[PDB]
Amino acid sequence: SGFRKMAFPSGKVEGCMVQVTCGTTTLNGLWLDDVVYCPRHVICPNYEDLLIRKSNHNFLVQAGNVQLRVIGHSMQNCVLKLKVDTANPKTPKYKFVRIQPGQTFSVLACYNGSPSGVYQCAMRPNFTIKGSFLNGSCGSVGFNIDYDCVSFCYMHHMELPTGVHAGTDLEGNFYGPFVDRQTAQAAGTDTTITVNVLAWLYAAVINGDRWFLNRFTTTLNDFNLVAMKYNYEPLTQDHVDILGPLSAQTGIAVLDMCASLKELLQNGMNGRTILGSALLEDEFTPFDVVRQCSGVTF
Amino acid sequence: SGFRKMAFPSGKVEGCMVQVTCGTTTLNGLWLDDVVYCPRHVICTSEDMLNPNYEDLLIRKSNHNFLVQAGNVQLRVIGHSMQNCVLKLKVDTANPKTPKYKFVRIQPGQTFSVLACYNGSPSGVYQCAMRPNFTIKGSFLNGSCGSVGFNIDYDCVSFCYMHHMELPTGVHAGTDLEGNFYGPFVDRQTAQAAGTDTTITVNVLAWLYAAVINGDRWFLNRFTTTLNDFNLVAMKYNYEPLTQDHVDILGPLSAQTGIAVLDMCASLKELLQNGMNGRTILGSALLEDEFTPFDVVRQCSGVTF
Ligand SMILES: CN(C)c1ccc2cncc(NC(=O)Cc3cccc(Cl)c3)c2c1
Ligand SMILES: CN(C)c1ccc2cncc(NC(=O)Cc3cccc(Cl)c3)c2c1
Ligand SMILES: [Cl-]
Numbered sequence: 347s348g349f350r351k352m353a354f355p356s357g358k359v360e361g362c363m364v365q366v367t368c369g370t371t372t373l374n375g376l377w378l379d380d381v382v383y384c385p386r387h388v389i390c391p392n393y394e395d396l397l398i399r400k401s402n403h404n405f406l407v408q409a410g411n412v413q414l415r416v417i418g419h420s421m422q423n424c425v426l427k428l429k430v431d432t433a434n435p436k437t438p439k440y441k442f443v444r445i446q447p448g449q450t451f452s453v454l455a456c457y458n459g460s461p462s463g464v465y466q467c468a469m470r471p472n473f474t475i476k477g478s479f480l481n482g483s484c485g486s487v488g489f490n491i492d493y494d495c496v497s498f499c500y501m502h503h504m505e506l507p508t509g510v511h512a513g514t515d516l517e518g519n520f521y522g523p524f525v526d527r528q529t530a531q532a533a534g535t536d537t538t539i540t541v542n543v544l545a546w547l548y549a550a551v552i553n554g555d556r557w558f559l560n561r562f563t564t565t566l567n568d569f570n571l572v573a574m575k576y577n578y579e580p581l582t583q584d585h586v587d588i589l590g591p592l593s594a595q596t597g598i599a600v601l602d603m604c605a606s607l608k609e610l611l612q613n614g615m616n617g618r619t620i621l622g623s624a625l626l627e628d629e630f631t632p633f634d635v636v637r638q639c640s641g642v643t644f
Numbered sequence: 645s646g647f648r649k650m651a652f653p654s655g656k657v658e659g660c661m662v663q664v665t666c667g668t669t670t671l672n673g674l675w676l677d678d679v680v681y682c683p684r685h686v687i688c689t690s691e692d693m694l695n696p697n698y699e700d701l702l703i704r705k706s707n708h709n710f711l712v713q714a715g716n717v718q719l720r721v722i723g724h725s726m727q728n729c730v731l732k733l734k735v736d737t738a739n740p741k742t743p744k745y746k747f748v749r750i751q752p753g754q755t756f757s758v759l760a761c762y763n764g765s766p767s768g769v770y771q772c773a774m775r776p777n778f779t780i781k782g783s784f785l786n787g788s789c790g791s792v793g794f795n796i797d798y799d800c801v802s803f804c805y806m807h808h809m810e811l812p813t814g815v816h817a818g819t820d821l822e823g824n825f826y827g828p829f830v831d832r833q834t835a836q837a838a839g840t841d842t843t844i845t846v847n848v849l850a851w852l853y854a855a856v857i858n859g860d861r862w863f864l865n866r867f868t869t870t871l872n873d874f875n876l877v878a879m880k881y882n883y884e885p886l887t888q889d890h891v892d893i894l895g896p897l898s899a900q901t902g903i904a905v906l907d908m909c910a911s912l913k914e915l916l917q918n919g920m921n922g923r924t925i926l927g928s929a930l931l932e933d934e935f936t937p938f939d940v941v942r943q944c945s946g947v948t949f
Contacts, residue, residue, distance in 0.1 A: 347783075347784070347810060347814035348781060348782050348783035348784060348814060348815075348816070349783055350770040350772070350782070350783040351649060351770065352760070352768035352769065352770045352783065353651060353768065353769050353770070354768065354769075355654045355655075355658050355759065355766040355767070355768065355769055356653045356654050356655055356769065357653075357654060357655030357656075357658040357659065357766075358655075360653050360655040361655065454653060455650070461653040461655075462653070463650035463651060463652060463653065463943070464650065464651050464652070464653050464654065464769060465648040465649065465650045465651065467648070476646060476648075476927065477646050477648065478645075478646035478647055478648035478650060478943060479645070479646060480645075480945055505645055509645035509646055509858070509859075510646075511646070553814070554814070619930070622781070622930075623929075623930070624928075624929035624930045625924070625928070625929045638768070638783060639785075640785075641760075641762045641767055641785045641787065641788070642767055643761070643762050643763065643765030643766065643767040644765065644766060644767060
């Protein structure tokens with residue numbers, strides 16, 4: 347029993363974190379095989395013009411107490427790839443994957459190439475992440491683990507004026523309409539991840555919290571008309587299908603759980619909590635709920 | 645900016661997790677140097693749990709009855725001893741991945757990271773706090789026994805908890821790494837219930853200072869209070885008493901934000917009376933008590949927004 351915001355074990359990623367220094371800027375790099383990946387703003391913009399002026403020895407890469415030798419450099423979108431003379435002996439089995447808004451991942455926050463903490467978060471529908479990052483955190487990475495393979499999905503680049511964070515996949519493509527430069531950029535209006543709130547309501551039922559259940563059902567169209575009014579993302583048939591296993595386990599149809607959610611939006615919690623929360627939680631996917639209520643190991 | 649429930653990186657602990665098997669029971673062990681630490685109830689059957697005589701059950705076992713598996717490698721047990729509610733299995737191989745470590749016993753209100761494990765394989769990491777009633781609100785399924793709680797301030801792992809059991813309310817009970825239980829619990833299937841839980845007042849105050857550091861001041865007021873008047877009001881909402889030690893510990897956060905501890909106590913009193921009125925504090929609609937003053941200083945910026 348119990349339900350916590352759980353991150354993947356970070357060990358396989360900790361063994362890849364390095365410190366990258368260029369001039370006065372120090373940030374984090376990800377060392378996989380003989381390449382160190384880091385945000386291209388470490389050279390700071392006309393990034394090709396700034397990069398052409400740099401030589402290999404201008405990039406100082408430190409792995410623990412060992413200085414790595416940079417033997418080449420190239421840029422891929424907003425990510426700088428530093429070829430080093432030593433392959434990381436701790437390189438895990440890995441993939442670079444681009445995630446969708448609503449999907450969750452673990453973040454290993456780092457400063458000076460040293461991991462300081464791990465937390466779980468979700469890619470918001472406005473493509474920002476509500477992270478916890480201070481100056482020096484750039485280059486910290488987001489990941490998921492499937493079996494023994496680490497899927498790297500995020501690299502931290504910047505903090506927006508509202509305190510939320512923006513970054514790229516490991517191929518340097520930003521999530522959201524953001525650019526790596528000091529300009530007037532703002533996070534768009536955010537919405538609630540509906541399929542994740544539904545998954546969290548199923549987790550609450552599995553853990554013995556059923557006060558919000560009712561005898562009613564709804565159509566997908568009527569639910570979406572209600573959901574649009576409360577700044578909730580539309581629920582698609584794909585979301586209904588994905589919630590199938592949780593529906594079969596608890597005996598509560600997806601549209602029956604939607605009728606519970608509709609009543610919670612229209613009337614509130616009335617002084618009650620669900621899984622120790624007074625707000626509807628949207629940072630657990632249906633897969634996260636099934637995994638945490640089954641004990642899958644890595 | 646931002647404020648998350650943050651756990652320590654778990655790598656140094658993952659390299660210590662092993663699977664311990666005795667008869668039909670399989671649970672987790674912590675392999676440090678040449679010793680595997682695990683809950684002594686691994687030697688029990690479910691029938692034995694009502695009134696187990698661990699000394700009588702242990703004397704009947706030999707080294708080769710304990711199967712220890714580290715990854716895909718079987719370790720050889722060359723000795724065994726019991727220390728309180730933990731079993732210490734001497735093995736013939738020292739763990740090459742043994743980090744710099746200490747065994748520390750924590751007090752209620754202290755936080756720590758938990759690496760939940762099944763069959764010696766880590767599945768997840770989360771942050772939690774030792775409740776005032778000595779239980780932890782964890783997330784554990786069957787097979788999680790032996791999973792450990794820890795802190796990693798600098799490069800040294802301080803092990804503070806080993807998971808032993810789940811109480812009827814769904815909360816969890818366990819021991820320090822010397823086998824002494826936190827709370828009035830026993831590793832026995834008997835009528836045991838968690839005592840009435842309370843809110844960790846000093847942690848809620850630390851979290852209110854974190855909110856001010858991050859730029860939010862809506863909950864502040866023009867009042868102050870005495871420590872005694874604050875405690876009289878706090879006890880009525882099931883909040884732990886705030887001691888002079890707690891006031892002293894909050895000193896640095898008070899100096900950084902410019903808000904006296906008893907001035908922040910007056911804001912908390914008002915929050916308890918009024919509720920949040922549709923507002924949130926650091927993205928939460930409830931008063932959060934699982935961040936210590938030390939956690940806030942470690943996570944938050946040194947410059948107040
Ligand atoms: C310095 N400061 C108070 C913080 C605090 C917190 C910060 C958290 N994350 C990242 C930071 N870094 C940046 O956003 C630097 C930056 C500026 C312009 C463009 C880009 Cl791509 C990157 C933080 C910076
Ligand atoms: C079996 N099951 C549904 C769960 C679920 C969840 C569980 C979470 N933690 C531990 C479990 N294990 C125990 O509490 C076994 C036990 C029983 C009586 C006394 C002792 Cl010392 C140990 C869990 C067991
Ligand atoms: Cl302590």
